[PDB]
Design an enzyme around this catalytic site. Structure first.
Site, PDB file in Angstrom:
ATOM      1  N   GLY A  25      32.582 -49.700 113.499  1.00  0.00           N
ATOM      2  CA  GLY A  25      31.327 -49.210 114.002  1.00  0.00           C
ATOM      3  C   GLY A  25      30.123 -50.054 113.632  1.00  0.00           C
ATOM      4  CG  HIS A  58      34.595 -54.971 121.259  1.00  0.00           C
ATOM      5  ND1 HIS A  58      33.874 -55.872 120.492  1.00  0.00           N
ATOM      6  CD2 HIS A  58      34.538 -53.775 120.589  1.00  0.00           C
ATOM      7  CE1 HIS A  58      33.375 -55.239 119.436  1.00  0.00           C
ATOM      8  NE2 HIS A  58      33.751 -53.963 119.476  1.00  0.00           N
ATOM      9  CB  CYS A  71      31.101 -53.576 116.679  1.00  0.00           C
ATOM     10  SG  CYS A  71      32.650 -54.175 115.859  1.00  0.00           S
TER      11      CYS A  71
HETATM   12  C1  LIG Z   1      33.210 -53.001 114.705  1.00  0.00           C
HETATM   13  O1  LIG Z   1      33.061 -51.739 115.183  1.00  0.00           O
HETATM   14  C2  LIG Z   1      34.729 -53.175 114.269  1.00  0.00           C
HETATM   15  C3  LIG Z   1      34.698 -54.549 113.616  1.00  0.00           C
HETATM   16  C4  LIG Z   1      35.469 -54.456 112.285  1.00  0.00           C
HETATM   17  C5  LIG Z   1      34.852 -54.597 111.054  1.00  0.00           C
HETATM   18  C6  LIG Z   1      35.660 -54.547 109.930  1.00  0.00           C
HETATM   19  C7  LIG Z   1      37.037 -54.356 110.060  1.00  0.00           C
HETATM   20  N1  LIG Z   1      37.590 -54.230 111.248  1.00  0.00           N
HETATM   21  C8  LIG Z   1      36.848 -54.276 112.338  1.00  0.00           C
HETATM   22  N2  LIG Z   1      35.088 -52.891 115.630  1.00  0.00           N
HETATM   23  C9  LIG Z   1      35.958 -53.635 116.462  1.00  0.00           C
HETATM   24  O2  LIG Z   1      36.006 -53.129 117.518  1.00  0.00           O
HETATM   25  C10 LIG Z   1      36.906 -54.795 116.144  1.00  0.00           C
HETATM   26  C11 LIG Z   1      36.968 -55.711 117.299  1.00  0.00           C
HETATM   27  C12 LIG Z   1      38.265 -56.511 117.343  1.00  0.00           C
HETATM   28  C13 LIG Z   1      38.097 -57.335 118.619  1.00  0.00           C
HETATM   29  C14 LIG Z   1      38.566 -57.318 116.082  1.00  0.00           C
HETATM   30  N3  LIG Z   1      38.126 -53.951 116.018  1.00  0.00           N
HETATM   31  C15 LIG Z   1      38.677 -53.222 117.172  1.00  0.00           C
HETATM   32  O3  LIG Z   1      38.139 -53.407 118.168  1.00  0.00           O
HETATM   33  C16 LIG Z   1      39.862 -52.254 117.103  1.00  0.00           C
HETATM   34  C17 LIG Z   1      41.110 -52.448 116.552  1.00  0.00           C
HETATM   35  C18 LIG Z   1      41.853 -51.238 116.687  1.00  0.00           C
HETATM   36  C19 LIG Z   1      43.175 -50.825 116.334  1.00  0.00           C
HETATM   37  O4  LIG Z   1      44.087 -51.708 115.729  1.00  0.00           O
HETATM   38  C20 LIG Z   1      44.377 -52.784 116.584  1.00  0.00           C
HETATM   39  C21 LIG Z   1      43.571 -49.521 116.626  1.00  0.00           C
HETATM   40  C22 LIG Z   1      42.679 -48.627 117.234  1.00  0.00           C
HETATM   41  C23 LIG Z   1      41.394 -49.033 117.570  1.00  0.00           C
HETATM   42  C24 LIG Z   1      40.986 -50.362 117.287  1.00  0.00           C
HETATM   43  N4  LIG Z   1      39.802 -50.987 117.515  1.00  0.00           N
END
Ligand SMILES: *[C@@H](O)[C@H](Cc1cccnc1)NC(=O)[C@H](CC(C)C)NC(=O)c1cc2c(OC)cccc2[nH]1
Ligand SMILES: *[C@H](O)[C@H](Cc1cccnc1)NC(=O)[C@H](CC(C)C)NC(=O)c1cc2c(OC)cccc2[nH]1
Lengths: 297, 305
Positions: free
Chosen positions: B143, B41, B145
């Site tokens: 971050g 991702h 991740c």
């Molecule tokens: C790890 O870097 C975060 C995981 C996390 C930890 C705690 C709270 N929220 C997220 N990074 C992610 O990339 C996760 C992965 C998704 C598949 C759940 N979040 C995103 O990828 C993400 C969401 C988002 C939004 O809102 C939808 C806006 C801009 C950028 C963005 N990136």
């Protein structure tokens, strides 16, 4: 999100850990530059040692220092308070930037529990008001150290020396000054009345709030002096203005005035938790500092 | 004595963490020999995350759109593969700090250490359990991740977990190091149901033995029970059913303590039905299920690496 008791990454300390043997006894030492630090009771056979008279009998070759398989050669020895300091022919190539630090009761640090010079595991704990810690320290664990890490710098604050008959742990800073009144002798020794670290409990409520746990958030406020009255009753440490100042950035994060948070806590102390939980604990947690919360939140 | 939730020493894993950047998304990678593993991702965009077509997205991508930074150093991305939900960025240099390692897919109920990282830089380490519902209750910020979970067997680092996402409920989900998610989760921005969790019964029993070994015996009772009658209490309290395999694994603990497994179960039964009456066990006002029987023996015999 989420909230866990986290330890510092242990790699920089793993590289300083050595085994020290003198006579029969083996424990752990910390190897920084060309010096190896360890508990002085490594030179004991225990109920009242004269450490000077027992040290006298020992010579450099009586000390076996092993860093992995490499046997270090000892060119000097001196005793500073409760630590022994072994000069070795070889500066540890893995010495991090470090400092020695004496922490204040209430502050937190990571412990790397070791046996024969090798690590078993890492865990976070706190210097209690009565200057003990509640760790996991088996025989041979003495010489394991506690530490904090700031970016690149390892601040060593604790070295393990003993277990009390109560099962809590006592030790020194890296100058060999014991935290608390304890001595490195084999007597029944009394810790002292313990108390909860109020500024840390408040920090953890602020953490709960930041994580969506707000059920304890009451519609009262209180005064510093009136809260303190309640804290004395529940053996909580008096809360000072310095503590309020420290909790400021969490106050402004959450928009919850410190003294408002104190009123929530007062009511928690006075009526319990009623079977509910806060960040998955059914107890008030006092081993997170305000710095700990900020670093993780 | 004493009993703590202890993480493995993290040094061997710290040397493997790198910072991976694709477009405006940076997160953590794991650098082993000449390969950097990270969540796929990373290649996604704000507008892509509801349902990315990862194949299409990966094709539009060029090695030079991937910046693997290792400390002050910058690594030369040579190839790009996709294995299930992980990216495999081949780089020129092999990691000189590569530990001996394995990739392993763990079972619900087993434990591991997480090295939480941000920008490729280690932040902290903590021990956790894969829940029966295949989530983990960790501490993971944006971050975080690409942080990894592992176990150490003296010499060899067994990687089992790579963090991908937080569910809208705040728990965490991720994959093994071949990129296969634990649980029904997918790497998209949609609501996804974890489904019902249970407490890891065999771990609660292991922890009661750890408590006895450490002087905490108040909960020990004069009763017994059978597996089947225990498993009726347990299902009522959303405890995992106890199997004979579980009883077998507790055998070494029963032997060192003098307490038959089914005896300990009888004590747990009573604890579920009547609570702890404001008392603690090993410092806890709740029943702890993140210590496996192997964790207990390891800590109590002081195993090292
Ligand atoms: C790890 O870097 C975060 C995981 C996390 C930890 C705690 C709270 N929220 C997220 N990074 C992610 O990339 C996760 C992965 C998704 C598949 C759940 N979040 C995103 O990828 C993400 C969401 C988002 C939004 O809102 C939808 C806006 C801009 C950028 C963005 N990136
Ligand atoms: C050093 O490896 C052990 C550390 C230890 C062992 C088991 C559990 N926790 C920590 N510490 C010692 O051997 C020291 C030696 C000192 C006194 C020079 N002694 C103790 O730790 C100690 C003495 C003692 C007594 O008095 C005999 C009563 C209760 C507990 C206790 N612990």
């Amino acid at each position: 999100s989420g909230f866990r008791k986290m330890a510092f990454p242990s790699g920089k300390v793993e590289g300083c850990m050595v085994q020290v043997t003198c006579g029969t006894t083996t424990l752990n030492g910390l190897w920084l530059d060309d010096v190896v630090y360890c508990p002085r009771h490594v030179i004991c056979t225990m109920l009242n040692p004269n450490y000077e008279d027992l040290l006298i009998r020992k010579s450099n070759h009586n000390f076996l220092v092993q860093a992995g398989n490499v046997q270090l050669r000892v060119i000097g020895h001196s005793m500073q308070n409760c630590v022994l300091k072994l000069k070795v022919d070889t500066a540890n190539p893995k010495t991090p930037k470090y400092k020695f630090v004496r922490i204040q009761p209430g502050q937190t640090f990571s412990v790397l529990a070791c046996y024969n010079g090798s690590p078993s595991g890492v865990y976070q704990c706190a210097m209690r008001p009565n200057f003990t810690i509640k760790g996991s320290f088996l025989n041979g664990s003495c010489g394991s150290v506690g530490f904090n890490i700031d970016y690149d710098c390892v601040s060593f604050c604790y070295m393990h020396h003993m277990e009390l008959p109560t099962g809590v742990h006592a030790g020194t800073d890296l100058e060999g000054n014991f935290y608390g009144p304890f001595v490195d002798r084999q007597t029944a020794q009394a810790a002292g009345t313990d108390t909860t670290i109020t500024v840390n409990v408040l920090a953890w409520l602020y953490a709960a709030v930041i994580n969506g746990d707000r059920w304890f958030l009451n519609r009262f406020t209180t005064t510093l002096n009136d809260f303190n009255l309640v804290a004395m009753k529940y053996n909580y440490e008096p809360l000072t203005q310095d503590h309020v100042d420290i909790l400021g950035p969490l106050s402004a994060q959450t928009g919850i005035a410190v003294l408002d948070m104190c009123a929530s806590l007062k009511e928690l102390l006075q009526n319990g938790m009623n079977g509910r939980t806060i960040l998955g604990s059914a107890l008030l947690e006092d081993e997170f500092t305000p710095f700990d919360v900020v670093r993780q939140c």
